[PDB]
Amino acid sequence: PKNKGKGGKNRRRGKNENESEKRELVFKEDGQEYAQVIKMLGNGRLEAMCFDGVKRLCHIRGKLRKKVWINTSDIILVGLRDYQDNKADVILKYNADEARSLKAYGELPEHAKINETDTFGPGDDDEIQFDDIGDDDEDIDDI
Amino acid sequence: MRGSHHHHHHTDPM
């Protein structure tokens, strides 16, 4: 199982069970600046410092709380002028995979260094279903 | 790899 593409001769499908999936990357917005997290706080906020060299506590968004992933070493976008400057509330979360696109985010240079990557998409993913194909392991047992 | 047709290519499903 290699080569992660889309169109060709793999997977095969065509039911159209209500379309509701599509990539949508977001870039920095006017009035809001991008930032980098250094430390994490309670939960409703996090410790971070703008690439320009400004350390401020970016509060986690409310609506985004449902789909906002913050890390101690990741890129993000926080709005300004809401806390009278100095502080900025994370408007959206800039993923690590997107980090390659960050060059496109017009925030980090081509020499910038991104942390975390994960084997395509998020990681961890606790709990598993099916888990078929194996049982007795076969082929290898002790390795 | 050995014994097929001169020289095969891509014989490992992964």
Swiss-Prot record, chain A:
Q: Which keywords label this protein?
A: Cytoplasm, Host-virus interaction, Initiation factor, Protein biosynthesis, RNA-binding, tRNA-binding
UniProt record, GO biological process: ribosome assembly; translational initiation
Name any one GO molecular function. tRNA binding
| Protein's cellular compartments | Cytoplasm
Chief subcellular location equals cytoplasm
- Which intervals hold domain S1-like? 21-95
List the biased-composition ranges (Acidic residues).
123-143
User: Composition bias, kind Basic residues: at what positions?
Assistant: 1-14
* GO CC annotation: cytoplasm; cytosol; eukaryotic 43S preinitiation complex; eukaryotic 48S preinitiation complex; multi-eIF complex; synapse
Question: Does the record bear RNA-binding in its keywords?
Answer: yes
- Compositional bias ranges of the Basic and acidic residues kind: 15-25
Q: Which domain of life is it from?
A: Eukaryota
According to the UniProt record, where is the region Disordered? 1-25, 113-143
Read off the InterPro entries from this record.
Answer: NA-bd_OB-fold (IPR012340), RNA-binding_domain_S1_IF1 (IPR006196), TIF_eIF-1A (IPR001253), TIF_eIF-1A_CS (IPR018104)
Gene3D superfamilies linked: Nucleic acid-binding proteins (2.40.50.140)
Q: Tell me, how does this one assemble?
A: Component of the 43S pre-initiation complex (43S PIC), which is composed of the 40S ribosomal subunit, EIF1, eIF1A (EIF1AX), eIF3 complex, EIF5 and eIF2-GTP-initiator tRNA complex (eIF2 ternary complex). Interacts with EIF5; this interaction contributes to the maintenance of EIF1 within the open 43S PIC. Interacts through its C-terminal domain (CTD) with the CTD of EIF5B; from the location of the start codon by the 43S complex until the formation of the 80S complex. (Microbial infection) Interacts with human respiratory syncytial virus (HRSV) nucleoprotein; this interaction recruits EIF1AX to the viral replication complex to facilitate viral genomic RNA synthesis and virus production.
Q: Which family does it belong to?
A: Belongs to the eIF-1A family.
Q: What does this protein do?
A: Component of the 43S pre-initiation complex (43S PIC), which binds to the mRNA cap-proximal region, scans mRNA 5'-untranslated region, and locates the initiation codon. This protein enhances formation of the cap-proximal complex. Together with EIF1, facilitates scanning, start codon recognition, promotion of the assembly of 48S complex at the initiation codon (43S PIC becomes 48S PIC after the start codon is reached), and dissociation of aberrant complexes.
From the Swiss-Prot or TrEMBL record, give the protein name. Answer: Eukaryotic translation initiation factor 1A, X-chromosomal
Source lineage: Eukaryota, Metazoa, Chordata, Craniata, Vertebrata
